[PDB]
Design a protein around this ligand. Structure first.
Ligand code: HEM
Length: 455
């Protein structure tokens, strides 16, 4: 098994002392192949890139979700929420059972109005820009996804489109996620040089906890019901144990929904618009569908479901740049991977999704091209070839929410504006916990189509 450059004591770790670790790992994969070993002080990981090996890794009888170093650090503020719990932790099963119906296709009918509320705000913002002015794409997409999850999660308005400086909760969340990712590169965590980082981290945790805990308390006092996750959780009983989630876990689920959902989804919308402006004939086809389908001043749930080609566009963006680009597994028992790589019980595997999605033996020679028509017939895609939302029982619980949101918003964008790549933008991918196009800007010329009133 191949292995990239080592640095004594530090092993491979310094290779990731970069602002773009995942793209670093992709370049290494390009040279080394379908599997390579990556060592840090005190840990070992095997990175997987081929569909041949990843299909075995996705066999839940042999491998289970692992809490990576990154997820362990995120747990300091996401607690035992769904994203950062072990599969066999009692609160995982319990929360999974309770929350499943909150994330179904039927639940999307209830969330639709609040998704439209924020989408309308985004469209109005762009309708109101003066001539020559431009749009900062990832920045606005993130305002949109944070505000949407705020409403659908706990009926709270962050009012991001009313601000230059985000709501303090958002600032704190973003900074805590930053600190979590930065901790990955620290050989000496308790060095006094990180005392300030530690102070800020605890302050940011308190900001998040204080707001969510207060809203939960207030909500239990009012009795108010909404189409939000908080109401569902306050009223929901586990099908198995018959118990509801306790108030602390409810808080962790609300924080979790925001962490897991806002940045992946905004990254997706950003990458999709990028690929559209770089491929004008695809943009035209997608805009034609939007105009054909979205015939009312405000889109309805049933109309979003008709945006088939927009859906193909989103899937092809997720193929090329899956915005949560890696997930971690561990071997349940000793086992041989792909017939040639022995694993010991507890051994960690990392699935490199962007590499999976560029496996020529699956997709063909043109894997680098943006072609939504790949997804015209789903039955064509082999099992475990396309995994932007993870695997099995530990797959993204938010998948239907993300796709409904992104399809609605991209559809409305295409209905209401023509877009210009005015700077001839060169793709630069920023890495946090997730991936996004840094500095992506466009100009949007309104088609001057009336936008209807909302509740
Ligand atoms: C394009 C958008 C999204 C992508 C690509 C994405 C991707 C993923 C992936 C790959 C995982 C598995 C992580 C692992 O194995 O460690 C995951 C899990 C999860 N995601 Fe998403 N996600 C997206 C949007 C969302 C949204 C909008 C929400 C909430 C509204 C959400 C909530 C969650 C939760 C709670 C989990 C953990 C589920 C469990 O293990 O029980 N995600 N997501």
């Amino acid at each position: 098994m191949p292995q990239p450059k080592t640095f004594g004591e530090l092993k491979n770790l310094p290779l990731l002392n970069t602002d773009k670790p995942v793209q670093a790992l992709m370049k290494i994969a390009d040279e080394l192949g379908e599997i390579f070993k990556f060592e840090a002080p005190g840990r070992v990981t095997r990175y997987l890139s081929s569909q041949r090996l990843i299909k075995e890794a996705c066999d839940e009888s042999r491998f289970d979700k692992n809490l990576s170093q990154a997820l362990k650090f995120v747990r300091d503020f996401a607690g035992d929420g769904l994203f950062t719990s072990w599969t066999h932790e009692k609160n995982w099963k319990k929360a999974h059972n309770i929350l499943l119906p909150s994330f179904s296709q039927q639940a999307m009918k209830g969330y639709h109005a609040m998704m439209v509320d924020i989408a309308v705000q985004l469209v109005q913002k762009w309708e109101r820009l003066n001539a020559d002015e431009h749009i900062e794409v990832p920045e606005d997409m993130t305002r949109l996804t944070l505000d949407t999850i705020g409403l659908c999660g706990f009926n709270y308005r962050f009012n991001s489109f009313y601000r230059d400086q985000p709501h303090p909760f958002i600032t704190s969340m973003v900074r805590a996620l930053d600190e979590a990712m930065n901790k990955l590169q620290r050989a000496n965590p308790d060095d006094p040089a990180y005392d300030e980082n530690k102070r800020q981290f605890q302050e940011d945790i308190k900001v998040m906890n204080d707001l969510v805990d207060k809203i939960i308390a207030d909500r239990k006092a009012s009795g108010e019901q909404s189409d939000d996750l908080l109401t569902h959780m306050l009223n929901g009983k586990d099908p198995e144990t018959g118990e509801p989630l306790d108030d602390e876990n409810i808080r962790y689920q609300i924080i979790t929904e925001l962490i897991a959902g806002h940045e992946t989804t905004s990254g997706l919308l950003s990458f999709a618009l990028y690929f559209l402006v770089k491929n004008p004939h695809v943009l035209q086809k997608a805009a034609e569908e939007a105009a054909r389908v979205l015939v009312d001043p405000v889109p309805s749930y049933k109309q979003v479901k008709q945006l088939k080609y927009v859906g193909m566009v989103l899937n092809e963006a997720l193929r090329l740049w899956p915005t949560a680009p890696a997930f971690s597994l561990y071997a349940k028992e000793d086992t041989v991977l792909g017939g040639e790589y022995p694993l010991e019980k507890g051994d960690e595997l990392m699935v490199l999704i962007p590499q999976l999605h560029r496996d020529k033996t699956i997709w063909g020679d043109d894997v680098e091209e943006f072609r939504p028509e790949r997804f015209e017939n789903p039955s064509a895609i082999p099992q475990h070839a396309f995994k932007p939302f993870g695997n099995g029982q530990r797959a993204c619980i938010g998948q239907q929410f993300a796709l409904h949101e992104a399809t609605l918003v991209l559809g409305m964008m295409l209905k209401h504006f023509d877009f210009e790549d005015h700077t001839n933008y060169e793709l630069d991918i920023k890495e946090t916990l997730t991936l996004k196009p840094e500095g992506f800007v466009v100009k949007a010329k309104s088609k001057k189509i009336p936008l209807g009133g909302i509740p």
